[model samples]
Each structure stands twice: as C-alpha cells, then as structure tokens.
Target: AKFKKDKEIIAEYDTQVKEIRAQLTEQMKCLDQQCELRVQLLQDLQDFFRKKAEIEMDYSRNLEKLAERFLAKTNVLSPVNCWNLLLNQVKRESRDHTTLSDIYLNNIIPRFVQVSEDSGRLFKKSKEVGQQLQDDLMKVLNELYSVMKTYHMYNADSISAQSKLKEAEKQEEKQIRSSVKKIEKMKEKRQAKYTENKLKAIKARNEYLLALEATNASVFKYYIHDLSDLIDQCYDLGYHASLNRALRTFLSAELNLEQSKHEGLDAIENAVENLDATSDKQRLMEMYNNVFCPPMKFEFQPHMGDMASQLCAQQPVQSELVQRCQQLQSRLSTLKIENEEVKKTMEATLQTIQDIVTVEDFDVSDCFQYSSIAKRRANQQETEQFYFTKMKEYLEGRNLITKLQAKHDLLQKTLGESQ
Candidate 1:
C-alpha cells in the first residue's frame, strides 16, 4: 500500500511537470511572435524616418537653388520688378503647405525630428524587453528540463516538482507582464505619433488661414491708399503690377456705381474730361456764373491721346456711360409722364371753373374758383416751361453723348486697324 501511494504521488507530479513545460513552450512561441512584431514596427519606423529626412533634404536643396537664381536675377531685373518677384515668392503657395516659407520654417522638419526621436526611444525600450525575455526564457526552459530530468532520474519528492512548477509559472508571468508593457508602450507611441501628425495638420491649416487674412488686409490697404493715384501714373509705365492694380480699381468703381445708382456721375466725368466741347464748357460756366464766376470761355487742355484712349476704352468706363445713358432715358420717360399729368390737371381745373360760372353753381362774387383757376393755370405754365427746357437740354445732352461715344468707338476702331 505504501509503495503504491508513493508511486501514485510521483505519477501525479510527473503529470504536473509535463503540463507546466507545455505551457512554457506555448508562452515562448507567443514571446517570439511579439519580438518579431516589435522588430517589424521598429524597421517600419526607421524607414519612414529615413524617407522623410531624404525628402526634407531635397526640398532644402531646391529652395537653396531658387535662392541662388533669385540672387542672379537682381542684375537682370529692375529694382521694382525684382522686388515684386520676391514678394510673389514670399506669398506663393506650395503643395502640402501654405507658402514656401511655411514649408521651410514650420511644416515638416520639426515634426519629423520629434517623431523620429520618440520612435527611437520606444524602439530601444521594446528591444530591451525582448532581450530580457530571450535571455530569461532560455534559462527558464533549461531549469524546466532539469526539473523533469531530476524527477525521472531520482523519482524525487513531489515538493521539488511543485517548486519547479511555481518557478516556471513566475517566469511565464514575468514574460507576460513584459509583453503587456511592450504592447502598451507600442500602442501609446503609435497613438502619440498619430496625434502629433493630427496636430501638425491642424496647425498648418490655421497658419494658412492667418496668411490669407494678412494678405487680404495688405491688399485692401494698398487699394485704399495708393492704388487710385497709382493707376493714372502707372498707366504709361506699362508695368504689369500697376496695370493689374488699375484694373482692380476700375472694377471696384464699377461695382460701387452699379449699387449706388450713380449713373449721372459718369456724365459729370465726361464733362470734366471734355471741357473744351461747347456745351460742357457752357454748362460749367453757367454753374459757376450763378455763384462766383463771370461768364468766360475756357480753353480745354487735352490729355495724351494714348492714355486717354486707354482710359476711355476700359470696359468699366464704357459700361458706366452706357448705364448712365439708360438712366437718362428713364428720366425722360418720367418727365413725359409728369407733363401729361400736369396737362390733365390744368384741363380739369378749367372745366370745373367753367361749370361754376356757366352751369348750376354759378356765382360771380365767389373768388374761390377764380383763385383756384389762376393757381392751376400758373402751375400749368411753370410745368410746361420746366418740361420744355428739360427736354431741350436732354436732347442736346444726348447728342453730345452720342458724339463722345462715336469718338471713342472710332478711336478704338482706328487703333485696331493700325494694329
């Protein structure tokens, strides 16, 4: 009975030892897989860092080449032209960036450096854990083998087997803890890298928006202060920058005139430009004659034909004149309607007065009808005189406008033929 008990105990310990060995073997396989994964992640990070660095260096070299070209062109380009070119460069956008400056100063370099540093740190930590597992796993496996060998060689007490089983369990737990830490750290690093890129993208977008705002602000200031005067002065300079500025001014003026219903303003401008014309001179003399000026004939100073022609030929200016003419036509229609209404009121008043005198309400002593009739007649005379005078002035103005338009069209036509 005693012998059977001892044998039974030994057999039980043998079973336990085999089970622990199998578990340790499975754990080693899992650890090997973890190490492989860590190595792959490290390699991938290294490759990404290397590619980013190469691209960054290439961009830097290209930027330096452009700087050299710009330096070389200063002798070839005028100061103003060179300055404009440099300003354009400063403002110009690049792929994946707001401007060339942004790409150089803020976008990729710092972020890549920081990410590479973090990757290296994480990779080192992972390698250390993997190395620890590799060294400790071999020693544990050997100890497990010794425990099994001793059990079979001496049929040792079950206490020794249990102790070996506990040690194996401890090693496995230690390795598992290391794997968990390694995986957690890897996940943290990956999350941090993604977050870093996300922040970078957000920052880049914000920076671009700021640049746009600043550009718009500068452009608006230039237009408000310098552009209007710059237009006439730079018209003959033939610089593209000034010409573009002038075009923008004309467009802004055209839009303002449209919204304000200020078409009569163009007629004023035409008068100012063509003051030598008899009617325009006469109108100006009449205006100041009432205030301070004696009626005097003024000589018109003509502008340079080319500059005047260019100014007149602008689409906004032409559109303004056409719109003003249409407005005048509308005013004529309104005047005709007013004339008709006044004539009808005068006729109705006369009929009422005739009825009061010759019909049932006859009263010679009552001056109400006479007074009303006199006022109505007077109003009709004033209305007729005002309407006739306005019509005559409008017709003459229309004739003058037609001549001006014909002159402009002829100038353009002649220019085209000459070209």
Candidate 2:
C-alpha cells in the first residue's frame, strides 16, 4: 500500500502517453500546414512577379516600336520640332517601362525566391528540433516505465514473503499445543525456519522500499521538469515568428521595387506633362503637306488552300460512325484478350484456394472432425464452425466467378457480332 503512487502511475501510463501523443500530433499538423501554406504562397508571389516583369518588358518594346515607326514617318526637315519632342516623350516612357522590367527581374523576383528558400530552411530546422525533443521525452517515459515494473515486482515479492513468515509463526503456535516428548528438538528445528522466513521477509521489504524510492523520484522528475521542457521546446520554437520575418522580407523587397520605379516614373511624368499640343500642331500645319498622309488602297488578300491537309488526311473525310466503329472494334479486341487472360488467372487462384484451404471430413452437423489423439489442436469448439462459414463464402465466390466467365463469353460474342 505504500507503493500506491507507483501502481497508479503504471495503471495510468497508457492514457497519459496516449494523450501526449494526441497533443503532439495536433501541434505538428498545424505547424506543418501553416508552414506549407507560407512557403507555397512565397513561390506563388515569386512567379506572379516574374510574369509581371515579362509584361513590362513586352510593353516597353512595343512602346519603343510605336515611337520609332511614327518618328520615321514624320518629316525630317520640319521648321517646328515639337513633333520630335512629342515622340521623344514616348521614347522616355518606353525607357521607364524598361527600367521597371529590369528592376523586377533583378531585384523583386530573386528576393522572393530567396525568401522562400529561407523559409524552407527554417521549417526544416524547426522540425528537427521538435523531433529531438520528442525523442528525449519518450526516452524518459520508457525509463520510468521500467522503474515502475521493477517496483511492482518487488512489492509483490515483499507481500508473499510476509505471508510465508506468518505461516511459519502460525505452525510454531500449533506445535506449542501438541503433546510430544521430543518437542524440544522440534522447537529448535522450527526456530530455524522461523528465523529464515523472518529474514527473507525483511530483505524483500527492504528491496521494495528501495525500488519505491527510485520510481517516485523518476516520476517526480518526469512530471515536474522534462515533460514541460519537451512541451516548451516543441511549441515555443517560434515557427510563426520566422514566417512573419519572411513576409517582412517580401514586403521590403516590394517596397524597394516601388521606390526604385518611382524615379523613372517621375521622369516619364515630367516629359509627358511638358508636351505642347499647340506648338506641335502649328509646326505641323505651318510646314507639312500631304506627303506623310497620302491615301492607301485596300485589295483582295485571298486565303488559298487547305491548312489541315498536312495535319490529317483530308481526302478520306470519314463519317463519325466509321470512326466510332473502328474505336469500338479496337476496344473489343483488347477486351477479348483481357477476358481470356483473367479467366486463366481466376481458375488458377480458385484451384489453389480449393486444394489448399479445404477442411477435413466431418459429421452431419459439421462439428466433429477431431481425432482422439489430437492434443496439438486448440480445442476451440468453433474451429470447425468458423471454417465452415468461411468455406461457404469461398464456394459462393467460385460460383460467381464461373457465372462471370459465362457472361464474358456471351459479351465477347455479342460485341463482335454487333460491331
């Protein structure tokens, strides 16, 4: 009874460890899901910016082309040069777009890629730390279990020893009342047994007390310190904080891109605002004629021959039913081979089941198949009955397989004739 605490610990060990396992499982799941989401979002943002940079490049090239084509169409010797200024502003806009593309590709995209890599590294390290902590806790728990088992064994031995000592003393009392002339010799013999039993009981109790001390100390240390340390290390590694830092990196990278683009954007804005439509029209009307604005003619541009003649055979131009019949025939032929192959496999398996898994001969009730010399058997009355039900299911399965084979034969015939 003094080792009641040890017994309780052993009895509750299953529920205690099971609950801890459940708790750790729940925590790891959420941790994994959150980190998974964060890293994937980082990749998503990186790819998004990558595509946006391409769009910037494409827009830049098209803007420059628009400027070049129009500037070449303008008169080279115009008196007023506001037309050149207007087209120059467009080229400036093109350069600003090019700057955007360059900054995004060189600055923004790679930063996001690096942020994702950092996040993955952090998640891996955090998981490793958590795994080590969990392993340590399990080690201590197993050690405690071992200690409790020893304590339990010693406590039981101590109790049995006490009972044997009581038996020894009780015999001595019974012998005291017996009338025998040789009682004195018997008294010395019985005293030896009493002393031996008493010493054995004392030793067993001492072992029990020592084991009790070890178990209680382990239980105290496990509950007071190591378990909490495990929880703290696994939970407070700041996975979320690391993720937040990664997002801050993302934010700063985006901000840097925005700040850099503003410089080019301001120059483009100034150039666009400085455009003088009044001066440009005066220059154009005052000096230009219709050499750059002549009328152009539109004529027939015929699309000549079959584009699909190279793709597929165009002369055959088969009907839908013809294609359908060929596909169906293809499937029927494949299935014809499939049916025969499965039948051969089915018979082989069924034959093995029947040959190897059968029961011995029994009575009418199907429950008396054991011989008189059967000592190696389990004597379970339902051994024959259990197999009887199982074999019935196997027979039903065999019948189903035969019926399926018949259906397959009929299906093969019907499919060929219909096609």
Candidate 3:
C-alpha cells in the first residue's frame, strides 16, 4: 500500500509532465509547419528579387547604350552643316530663310533640346528612386531573416526537449517490455514442464491477465487512456459508461488470450445465444423490479423510487404511479435490447483497440542521430535568398510598367510636337 501510494504520487507528477509535453509537442508541430511554409515562400520571393535585380542591371546597361547613341548624334550636329543637321534644319524651316530664325528661336531647336534634357532628367530620377526602394526592401528582408532565425532557435530547443521526453518514455517502455517478456518466458517454462494442454491454456490465460494488469505507468496509462476514449464512445451510444467499459475490457482480453475452443468468451457467447429467449426476457423483466416485483430490496430504494415532479398535495397517486410503472417497463425493454447489441459490438471493438496498442520490436538505427547548430545557420542563407528574390521581382516588374508608360507618353509627345 505504501509503495502504491508512492506510485500514485509519481503518476500525478507524470500526468503533469505529459500535459506539459503535449503542449510543447503541439507547439513544435505548429512551428515546424510554419517554418516549412515560410521557407518555400521565401525561396520563391528570393527568385523574384534575383530576376528583378538582373532586369535593373540590364536596364542600366541599355541606358548607357542609348546615352552613347544620343551623344554620337550631338557630335555630328556640332557644325550644323553635316547632312544630318542640314536635313533636320531644312525639315524644321521648310527650306525657307524667312521662317528659319523664327523656328529656331521660338519652336524647333528649343523643343529638341528640351526633349533630350527631359529624358535625361527622368532617367536619373528613376534610377535614384529604384536604388532607394532596393535599400528599403533589403532592410525589410533583413528583419524577416531575423524572425526566421529566432524560429529556428526555438525549433532546436523544442526538438531537444522532445528527444529527452522520448528517451524517458523509452526507458519506461523498456522496463514494461522486459516484464512482459519475462512473464511470457515463465509461461513457456511451465508449458515445457507440464504435460496437459488444458493446464497450459489455463495457466497462460492467468499469466496474460497478470501482464495486462502490470503496474508500469507509461504504457499502462497510454493503454488506459485509449480505453477511456472507447468507453466515452459507449456513453454516446447510450450504454452505462463505467460498467460497459469494464465489461468491454474483460471480454476483449478473454477473447484474445483465453482458449476460444475450450473455455472463454466465445463459449459464453455461444451459451447466451443458444439459451431460450425466455431466459433473457425474464432477466429483463426483473431488471427494473421496483416497478414489477413486490418490494424494494436495495437499501436506498425507499428514498429513491420517484421524485416530486408534480405537486405532492394530490389526494390519490395510484393511477399516476401505474402510468409511471408502465412507462418504465417499456423503457426497460428497450434498454435490454440495446444493451445486448452493445455487448456484442463491445467485444469486436475492444479487440481492435487492443491490436492498435500492441507493440512490436523495431530497429531505430538513426535514432541517436544529432542535428548540430549548422541547421540554424543554413536558415539564414535560406532567408537571404527569400528576401532578395521576392522584393526584386516585385520592384522590377513595377519598374518595367513605369518605363512602358513613359514610352507611351513620349509617343504622344512626339505626335503633338509634329502637329
């Protein structure tokens, strides 16, 4: 009893630990999922930024080429007698000297110089804006990178704690597993020593029950917890919860470990089904005996039979009492039918639950493999790639749209100038 008390206290502590472990495990799962999604998004974003940067570099190169072309045109126009200059001057003045001064002073030459200057100034402003935007984007990327780094650090801590929990669970499982093996060995030894099959079967069943009742906390608790859920399921189906749960567990074990051909629940099922239907009918009739039988037998029966649903001031209650008894009899019949069905279902369902919980030998060769701090460092590289790729693509696309709009405006300007 003293040892049992110590175990109960330990169980209490373990329950607290399991609850804490559950919270941490859920957090870790959530963190890992978020990290994976973010990493994918970041990779795509990085690719976008990389492409955008390439576009900017190419645009700058194109600007350099256009500038060279403009300068070459200016060089040819120095004397204003070059064919190119003469042609342009004649075109502007319509080859007339009367209007040449007017056009050059008031219209043609000034507009050409203004167009060139406007293009140069616009390009310069755009380049400056792009550089500033790029810097701001980089700053935002750096912040997100820091966030990912923190997540990785937390991930490391969570995984380490999980490993420790796993190790502790492993030790507890090892002891229970060892005990199971020892009991099996003892059963085998007795079988080898004994001659009769009947004796062996009975002995094996007893030993199996003992193992089933093993006092190990971790495995037993897990098994019990699972069984508890099944019991709750019975409640939902309208079975008396605790009684149904205990019955299910007993029958489930009897079916699994006991001799089906000789002396177990299979035999019980056969006897129950083969017996006359009247046997169960009688049992059902007697079940709610306060309504059917003569007197109350249970100690609490006198005070518990009926409660005051209506006023207790009524003169005669015998008619009301008869109606209540008939209603209860009908309910009892329905319950008995449901109860039989539940018992049948329970046997099959519990066997399935047992199979799910049954452990097998496994080989975990890489179980001890440790992840170093290098993984966290890798995350930074991942973050950088993300920031650059996304921001650059976003910026570069906008830049292209702006350039296209400017070209359209220039086309409109050229049309107006010609008119």
Candidate 4:
C-alpha cells in the first residue's frame, strides 16, 4: 500500500458507493412512474364512466318522455293501440337505462373511485418507503465518500513530506565535505527538517489510517445491513408487490362496474325483443270484442217502395263498392306484414349495436402490468456488488446498448439473409 502511494491514487470502493446510489435512484424513479401511471389510469377511467353515466341518464329521460308524449294521443283500440304496447316496452327499456345510470353513478363509478383511493394510498406509502431506503443508503455512502477524500488528502500530505525530508537529507550530504561550520549548519537544518517532516508524516499516516478504517467499516456495514434491507424490503418484497396490489385493486372495481353494466344491457335487449306488436293487437282485439260484441253486417231493409233506378244501381254499385273494400283490406294486410318485418330487422340491427356496446374487456381483468417484472418469493438482501455492478453497467450500458442498436441492423440483415 505504501509502495502504491508512489504511483496511483483513487477513492476506495467508490465503485460500490457510486453504483449503489445510482441504482437506488433508478429504482425510485421506476417506482414513482409506475405508481403515477396507475393513478392516472384510474382517474381517467372514472371520468369516462362518469360521462357514460350522465349520457345514460339523459337517454333514459328522453325515452321516458318520448313514450309518454305519444301515449297521450291514443290506444283505445286500433293499430295505434298495438303500437302503444311498443311504447310500454320502450318505457321498460327507458327504466333499465335509468337503472344503469344510477348504478354507474352510485355503484360502479363510486366503487372504482374508492378502489383507486386505496391504490393511491398504497402507492403513496411505497413512494415514501422507496425514498427512505435510498436516503438512508445515501447517508452511509456520503459518509464513506467524505472519509475517502480525507484519506486521499492525507496520503498526498504524507508523500510530499517524505519527498521534502529526502531532499533535505540529500542537501546535507552534499555539504558534508565543505567548511566544518557549513557542515554543522547543514546538519542542524537537516535534523530539524527531518524532525518536522517525520512528525507531519506520522500524523498524516495515522490520519490516513483512520480514514481507511472508517471507509472499510462503511463498506462493510453498507453491504451487510443497509443494502440487504433495501433489496429485500423496499424493492423486492414491499414495492413491487404493492405495485401489483394497487393495479389489481383498480381492476376489481372495473370488473365490478362492467359486470353489472353487461347484465343490464342484456336485460334491456330482452325487453326490447319482447316488444311485439302482434300479441298486443290480438289480445286487445279479443278483449275489446268481449267488451262490446262484434257488429252485425249491414242489413238490407225496405227504405221505401224500391224505386227501379235504385234497384238497377244498387246491384252494380254495391258490388263495385264491396270489391273496392276487398282490395283495400288486401293492401292493409300486406302493409302490416311489411311493417312487422321492418320492425324485426330494425331490432336485429339494434342487437348488433347493443352487442358491440358491451364492456371492452380484453386487458383489464386478471391480466397484469407487474408480471413481467415481478420477482420470485425470495429475492433483491443482495450483494452490494449486484447494485454496484448494475449501476456501473447502466452508466456504461447506455452507450453499449445504443452501440448495439447499430449492430442490430447487421443482426437484422442476418435474418433478412434467411428470407
């Protein structure tokens, strides 16, 4: 070590402290971003659902009004009466929409908000823990670095003192063969110089020794205690687990809202499909016929002594009128069928729209954001070397990875060659 003082000087175990600090910083940043994005995810989702709830409520009101406004005019008994039955079905649909809106506002959106609040709380705790872990490790690292500076300065002072003493001895040796007085003078000066430097040198050596010991102690304690806790508690066991927990909590509410919304839509679909005018018309007609018996066909009676012109006109005119009535009935029957098909096709198209409108549930359910990065059951009371090396690697690794990007082109060419 003394021989090396003649050649080189560098901070002791700086690599460990440097990388350990940087790695912790990187991890803290990662944890923060993960939490931030998670909170934003929930915030944005709730806002959207809130908007959906508002629109659903408005739609329900509009449907209710539409049914009521039209229902006022008729349905005593006619095709209009059958159509009124459709209005009733629509009111049922309107009521369903109203229920959906209520759930979204009261049940779905509020629950999601609550779950997000839980996640936010965990995220906040995680941030604090991560920060504390980094800050504590940094405190130790800073102490070690400060002492290393002392060690280097002390080493420099000792080396310079040794050089000056050696020079004084050389000068005294050169003056020894000259006048006795000069020789004596030189010897006295050399002795004093030797004493001065030797004192300073011993002090510097002791100081440097103290520094070295402190640095080593810092390194030992850091690796054994602080680094272990950081890896185990902050990064591995607590932080990442909380990240997943927060995200899953958000999902629980999302799954909840969408599940209820899904079933509600199906209910509306069933009722709308049940809005058949055919049954309404048949039932109404049957009931009305019982209420007031069917009218008899018009009876022919002597209106007066039958006039010859009336009799002649009656045969041909009555037949012509009855034939026209037959044609009109045929047209009405076909038109009713046409309208029925139109209604059915409209319902079919609505079914397509309704199906598309359901919860878009591809990713948010049991899927995960943390799985790829998640660790095993036991994992990061790790060697200081792990963080140290990783931090060091990353500092240089940025350049390496980017340099490889250019190399990636060549690698891609290799794949292209196969093609």
Candidate 5:
C-alpha cells in the first residue's frame, strides 16, 4: 500500500512539472514576439525622424534663397519704385515665421509610456492565463494519479523506475524555471533597449529642430543685411529715394526719360548709318531734322547720378559744348519735355491694356464704350468715393500729370513758334 501511494504521488508531481514547463514555454514565446514587434516599431520611428530632418533642411534652404532674391531686388531698387515712405510701409509688412522651439516634451515620451503600458498589460494577461492553465493542469495531474493508485502495480515496477522518473521530472522542472528566468531577463533588457532608442531618437529630433531654427534665424539676419544692402545700392546708384509724394512720380519719370533717350540715341545712330546718301551732308541734315528728329526727340533716357558721372569721366567734354550734359548736372532741369507728352499718350494705351487683364471680367457690351472718359464716367459714383478717400493722392498725381503735360506742350509750342 505504501509503495503504491508513493508511486501515485510521483506520477502526480511529474504531470504538474510538465504542465509548468508548457506554461513557461508559451509565456516565453509571447515575450519574444513582443520584443520583435518593439524592434520593428522603433525602426519605423527612426526612419520617420530621418525623413523629417531632410524636409526641414530643404525648407530652410528654399526660404533663405527667396529671402536672397527679395534682397537683390531691394538693393538694386525698390521693387515698387514708389516713394521711400510708401516703400518703407511695404517692407514693414513682409514679416518672417518665428523659430520653432526645441525639446518636443509632449511627443515621444508619452508614446513610449503608452506602448509600454499596453505591452505590460498584455504580458500580465498572458501570465494570468498561464497560471490558470497551470492550476487546471495540476488538477488533471491529481486526477490521473488517483486513477493510477486504484489500479494494481506490477511487482517489477520497482524503486529504480521511480528514482529515474524523479530525476527526469526534476531536470524538466529546472529547465522550465531557467526558461522563465531567461524570458524575464530578456524582456527587461529589450524594454531598456527600446526606451534608450526612443530617447535617442527624440533627443536627435529636438537637436535637429534646434539647429534648423538657428539656421533660419541666422539666414533671416543675413536677409535683413541683404535688404539693407539693396536699399543702399539704390541710393548709391543714385535713385532719388525721396519720401515726398509729389516728387516720387516726377523722379521716376525723369529716370525713365533718361533711359529712353539713351536707348533712342542708339536707334537713331543705327538709322543714320543706314541712310542711302550717307555722304551728302545736305541730304543727311534734312533726314536728321525730318525723319530722325521726330522719333529721336522722344528718346531720352537718364542714368543714376553715378552712371552720369561715369559717362562724364570718360568723355571729359566741357559742359558748354554738351548741352544735355549741362542740363543733367543742373537741378530743376527740363531737357526732354517732349517725351512726357508721348508718355501721357502711352499711359492711356497702357490703362486700356491693363483693363483687359482680368479676362473673366470682360463685358462685350462695354467694349463699344471703351473711351477712358466714358469708362470713368460710367463708374462716376465709385470714382467719387475713391477720389474723396484718396483726395490728396488724386490731386498729387493729377497735378503732376497736368504740370508735366503743360510744360511739355509749352516747350513744343515755344520751339515751333521760334522755328
């Protein structure tokens, strides 16, 4: 009876030990899978970080280049070519984006905690299931032993058999315990590695963002320098960077005239060179006064003061001999008022062109009434409001045009009268 009881007890122990080992194996598998998943997730995160950094670098470079372009235009002259006060107002409005802050305290760390919590929860649930399975296995083992005791054992089933079974059961249990310990250790190490990797990635992103901000700020500073340089360049080039509203348009017109005259002189020279009777001084003088003079009279282009100075340097002509040079050097000069009348005619043509720019707003019915006086009269109510609101401006531009036209007409009349 004693031997039978002892044998049954050994069988029950063996069953429980096997159950424990199976539970341990299942738990280890789950842990290993979790580790692999964590690795893949981390890899994806690292790749995302790398791509973001590249985009930021590209954005910074493009912004710097745009800033440089604006600076160039400004240095050469005000892009608007308006009064200094008006240009200053426009310059003040084009502000830049602020630098981004470092240390994304809310993005990476919390995500790690959430993932770890979820993984930990899954492990705990698995452990509970394993423990429950082990308990059920122990109950089955007890039942199996109870049945074995009820059956009669053979006389040959001796102590040696029991000892060998005991040794095998002990070895299996030891292996199961070792496996559980190894799995626990591995889980811990992997968790640490994942955390380290996550922190490293976060830190790297933060550092890159900081560097990007610094780069943008530095570039903006240079942009400011470039803008200043552009302004100075315009002034140095001798653009009359005046603030007076009345003088701004006149200055622009003067500059435009000088540029026109310079270009016209080239065309006139070309036309003279192509004349059929190049050697007949009388025919040449007649062509010069008739065919050449009319168009050439409208061609008067001025340069920046520095450019005029440079031309004077090369020619070294006495001011008395060069009537145009004397006029250019003098203040309140009116060298080519003839071109201003031509410009008024051209401006009317330009307004007609600009009115059709927004093709979608075209009205066929309004086409027949394309006269400036008629068009402006049709919008008389709106025009009144516009003029009232900008009366000072309206008067200034109107006065300038009126004065320039009157002077131009007077000069032509005087010249005709004298002739």
Candidate 6:
C-alpha cells in the first residue's frame, strides 16, 4: 500500500509539472499579444513613414517643377541651380517634421537665387539695347524727314521755273507775230517818209565816209567832228533810236547766228526748245549760248529752222555761261543719283526698324507657358511614381510582418507541444 501511495504522489507532481507547462505556454501566448501589438505599431509607423515619404517626395518634385519653369526660361541660370533650390526647400521642410531623408540641399538654394538675379539683370540689359535701337531708328527717321522736306522744296522751285518759262515763250511768240504783221503793213506808208530820211541819211553817210578816208590819211580832228555829225544825223532820221531800242534783241539774234556758224555741220544739234520773253538781252544770250556751246569743250550745235526772234550780238560772256550751265547740269545729275541711293538706304533702314519692332514686341509667354505647363505635368508624373513606389514598399513591409507573425505562431506551437 505504501509503494502504491508513493506512485500516486509522483503522478500528482507530474500532473503539476504538466499544468505548469500549459500555464507557461499560455503565458507565452500572452507574450505573443505584446509582439502582435508591437507589430501593429510597427505597421502603423510604416504607414506613417510611407505617407510622409510620398508627401515629401511629391512636395519636393513640385518645387523642382516650379524651379524648372524658371530655369528653362532663363538664359543665365542652369537647371542644376533650379534643382538645388528645390532640394533645399525640401530639406527645410523635412528637417524636423518627418523621417524623409534630405540628401541634396547643403549649400545650393542661395546659389540658385544668385543665378536668377544675374539672369534678371541680363534680361534688363537686353531690353535696354532694344530700346537703344528704337531710338536710333527714330533719329534716322528725323533725318529722312528733313531731307524729304528740302527735296520737295527744290523740286517745286524747279517745276515752277520750267512752267513760267513755257508761258513766257508763248506770250513772246504771240506778241512778236502780231507786231511783225503790223510793222509790215505800215512799211509801205512809211516808205515815202523813208525816202526823205534816206536823202538826209545819204548825205550823212557821205560825210562819215569822207571822215573815215581822212582818218586813214592821219586827219584826227576832222575824223572826230565828222563822226559826231554822222551820229547826230542818224538820230534825227530815227535810225539811231531804232537801233538803240532793239540793240539787245539784235545782239541776241547775232549771237544765234555766230553760234550757228561755229558748230554748223557734223556737230550734235542742241535745239533751243524754250525761251523767256521778259528776260534781259544779256540773260537771253546766256541761255542761247548755254544751249549751243555747253562746256565739255565740244561745240554745242544749233538748229534755227524757223524763227522770227531777234538775232544775238557778239558778247564776251557766252563761253562762261555755257560752262556754268554744264557744271550745273552735272551737279543736278549727281544729286539725283545720290537721292536715289539715299532712298534705297532709307527703305532698308525702315525694314530694319520694323524687324527690330517685331523682335521687341515678341511674346515670351507663347513658349514660356507651354514649357511651364509641361514641367508641371512632369512633376505630377514623378509624384505619382513616388507614391507608387512608396505604396509598393509598404505592402512589402506588411508581407514581411505577416511572415514573421507566422514564424512566431510556429514557435508558440512548439513551446506548447505537450498540449
């Protein structure tokens, strides 16, 4: 009986051990609750970190996109400067707020600001240069206005002179024709009077001839007296008055004859197409001489086909007038050519000014708006990619937590093998 009782006692002890082991397993399961809570916290932290990373990355990417917009439009700053600005902004936002890593913003955002400032200054200078070009164009236009004003004045004067000359020539021709006809009709009536005057004139002519013959014989005093008497007789007979009154007309006619003789044959004909009636005889002779003997030292030819005008007299100023007109003609021709060239140059300058205006008025937004929108879209895409990666990593972490939990369950089961 004692031996059997000892065996039962040992059985009780074994039962107690088994009960303890079961209790220990239960305790271990309680420990698993703590692990589960810890894993839950870890998963919560992972979600938070993932969201944080996504927000930070998205924010940084958006900033970079904004920077890129500025960078693309700027000629003085580089894209790298823009990126640096973005990175620094991210770092500033993420330093104490989240677990997002700041990998690239140590000493670069200020550099970006500097580059932007430089680009701004350069843009201002470009605008100033464009303004200067506009000012220069205005100056050229002023000069052209002055030149055109002078040209028009001179052109008007030349046209008016030509018109006046034409009208005067017509008047002179009409007057001369009427006067010649009237004089011809009166010549018969005056013929009888002319006989009496001719008789007196004949006596004076004889005296003048005798005086001339005496002068050849060295009779100086008689020569002077007889010549004076002959001049007085000519005056009384109306011959001196007629000659004096028409002397200028006679001289012009004589000048025409002499010019005709000088360049009569084989010379290029320079026909006088116009004449001024009110002009002095000296001026009339000059006009004829300019036409018939224009200087180039070539004999200027004359054509007197039909004319009722008075003839020219010998003048000492014919050659000078011809030379002067020739030089004037050459100068006029040169001025005309120069004016044509100036017109062409002015046209080109105007075109250049137009081109400059086109450039100055160019719309920068046409291209800048497109580039800015594109950069914004790019940032959105990058943000989407960042969230995608973050979500994928979060899921992977969840999967690892699941696997670890499975291993924990297996350990608990092995620990509770007695059950």
Clash count in backbone of candidate 5: 12
lDDT of 2 by residue, 301-394 (tens): 5468534322221335434434544555565566556556655655565565555435555347645666543642443333444555555655
lDDT value for model 1: 0.49
What candidate 5 gets wrong by more than 4 Å, as runs, is 1-31, 72-143, 146-356, 360-419
Worst 10 residues of 6 by lDDT: 265-274
lDDT of 5 by residue, 193-230 (tens): 55555555455545545654654454454335533543
Q: Which is the better candidate, 2 or 6, if ranked by TM-score?
A: 2
Candidate achieving the largest lDDT:
2
Per-candidate TM-score against the hidden true structure: 0.24, 0.44, 0.19, 0.39, 0.25, 0.20
Query: How many residue pairs clash per model?
Result: 0, 0, 10, 0, 12, 10
Task: For candidate 6, write residues 216-301 as lDDT tens digits.
Answer: 44323323443344335321234234334333433454465445444532121221212223444555466678665645654435
Please report how far candidate 1 places residue 65 from its true position, in Å: 3.3
| Total backbone collisions, model 2 | 0
What lDDT does model 6 reach?
A: 0.44
Q: Best candidate per TM-score, number? A: 2
TM-score of 1: 0.24
Compose the digit string of candidate 3's lDDT tens values, residues 1-419: 35433345445645755664565356445534643453454344344434543554455455455445644675212232233433333232221222322333344334334433443454345434434433443333333333333444444444455555555445555666667676556545444434343344455445544543442343344335533542243212321342344335434533543342233334344443455546556665777567677664534333567664332323366445444445545554565565555455545554544454454536687898887568755765555555456545545554554554554444334333222
**What is residue 282's positional error in candidate 5, in angstroms?**
48
- lDDT for each of the candidates? 0.49, 0.62, 0.44, 0.61, 0.45, 0.44
* Candidate 3 clashes between residue pairs 3 or more apart in a chain or in different chains: 45-389, 45-390, 46-389, 46-390, 47-389, 48-389, 48-393, 49-389, 49-392, 49-393
Residue 334, model 3, lDDT: 60
TM for candidate 5 is 0.25
